[PDB]
Amino acid sequence: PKLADYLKLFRACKQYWFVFKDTSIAYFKNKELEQGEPIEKLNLRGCEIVPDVNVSGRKFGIKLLIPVADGMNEVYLRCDHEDQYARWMAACILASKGKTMADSSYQPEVISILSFLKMKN
């Protein structure tokens, strides 16, 4: 169960290689480096998730509010399109509840998310 894509990061937008594993996201300068040392690794367990979507505007954003000792760490992921967004958003939603992509609810979740976007398309 691995999910890996180039996504744009806002806190300013820079594109990085992102890897979803377990309940965490890690990112790197590019995909040839995914083996080495991540720029940062974020555990999404117990995070808050805010969708930032404008289908006709071609905007597919994921705002993540990650609990830290001194508050929320705000992480904004911009996806390149609807299918990528559905897979990443579904993964984020499961992770916030402590679930991985191995959970049998992952693919139906991708499907649900996607149907709404296909319909607006």
Question: How many angstroms separate the CA atoms of 48 and 32, rounded?
Answer: 31
Helix (H) or strand (E) holding 36, with range, is none
Contact 114, 120 (CB under 8 A): no
Per-residue b/e over 28-44, b at no fewer than 16 CB within 10 Å? beeeeebeeebeeebeb
PDB resolution in Å: 2.1
Question: How many angstroms separate the CA atoms of 25 and 4, rounded?
Answer: 10
The separation between the first and the last C-alpha atoms of the chain, rounded to the nearest angstrom, is 29
Annotation: CATH topology of 1-121: PH-domain like (2.30.29)
Q: How was this structure determined?
A: X-ray
Q: Edge to edge, what strands does the sheet with 3-10 contain?
A: 40-43, 24-28, 14-21, 3-10, 71-79, 59-68, 48-54
